[PDB]
C-alpha cells in the first residue's frame, strides 16, 4: 500500500520500499517509475527524481565498489544500460 | 497438510487459546512434516533441497 | 547528442527499461509458479492476474 502509491504518485524517493523490493531490478523499476523529465515547478524537490539525478546516483554516488563489480559485473552493466548510460556501460564492459 | 492450506496460521491459533502449555512442539513437528510431505510433490530440485 | 538529450527519446529509454524489467519479473514469476505448481494452484485460466 506504500509502494503502489510511491509509484503512481511519484513520491518519497527517500524510501526504497525494501519490505517489498529486496533486489536491484526492483530498485531500478521503483526509481524508474518515479522519474520525471518535466520542469513542473508545482512539484517539491524532495519528491523530484530526474533521470539525470538517477544516472549520477548510480555512476558517482554509489559506483563500482557498491555493486561488487568483480562478482556481479553483468548486474552493474544492467544498472548502467537500463539507465541509458551506454558509453559508461561500454567503457566498463571493455575493462574486463 | 492434505488439502494444502499453510499450517502456520492454525499452529499459531492453537497457542493463543493456551495460557502456557505443551501445544508448541506438536505444532513445530507439524510444520516440519508439512514441509517434508510438500518436498515429495515438489519437482524443482532447488526448491526441494530448500 | 540532440537525440540522446531529447525529452521524448529519454522517455522512450525509460519506457523500454521498465518494459524489460517487467517482462524479466514475468519470466521469474512464471518459472517460480511452474516449478512450485502444487503450492501455486494455477488451475486452467491464462492471464497475469
Amino acid at each position: 500500500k506504500r509502494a503502489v502509491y510511491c509509484i503512481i504518485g511519484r513520491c518519497d524517493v527517500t524510501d526504497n520500499q525494501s519490505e517489498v523490493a529486496d533486489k536491484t531490478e526492483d530498485y531500478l523499476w521503483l526509481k524508474l517509475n518515479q522519474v520525471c523529465f518535466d520542469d513542473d515547478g508545482t512539484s517539491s524537490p524532495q519528491d523530484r527524481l530526474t533521470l539525470s539525478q538517477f544516472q549520477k546516483q548510480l555512476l558517482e554516488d554509489y559506483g563500482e565498489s557498491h555493486f561488487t563489480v568483480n562478482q556481479q559485473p553483468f548486474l552493474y552493466f544492467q544498472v548502467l544500460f537500463l539507465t541509458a548510460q551506454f558509453e559508461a556501460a561500454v567503457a566498463f564492459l571493455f575493462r574486463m | 497438510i492434505r488439502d494444502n492450506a499453510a499450517v502456520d496460521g492454525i499452529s499459531l491459533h492453537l497457542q493463543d487459546i493456551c495460557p502456557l502449555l505443551y501445544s508448541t512442539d506438536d505444532a513445530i513437528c507439524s510444520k516440519a512434516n508439512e514441509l517434508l510431505q510438500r518436498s515429495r510433490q515438489v519437482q524443482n530440485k532447488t526448491e526441494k533441497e530448500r | 547528442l540532440k537525440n540522446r538529450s531529447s525529452v521524448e527519446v529519454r522517455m522512450e529509454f525509460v519506457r523500454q527499461a521498465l518494459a524489460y524489467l517487467e517482462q524479466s519479473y514475468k519470466n521469474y514469476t512464471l518459472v517460480t509458479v511452474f516449478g512450485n505448481l502444487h503450492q501455486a494452484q494455477l488451475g486452467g485460466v491464462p492471464g497475469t492476474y
Partner: peptide, 24 residues
C-alpha cells in the same frame, strides 16, 4: 537505507546444485 540492494531476481533460481548433465 537509501543505497540499493546488490542482487538479481534470478538468484532464487540459481541456487546451488550440479549445474550440468541434464537427464530424464
Amino acid at each position: 537505507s537509501g543505497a540499493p540492494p546488490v542482487r538479481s531476481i534470478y538468484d532464487d533460481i540459481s541456487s546451488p546444485g550440479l549445474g550440468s548433465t541434464p537427464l530424464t
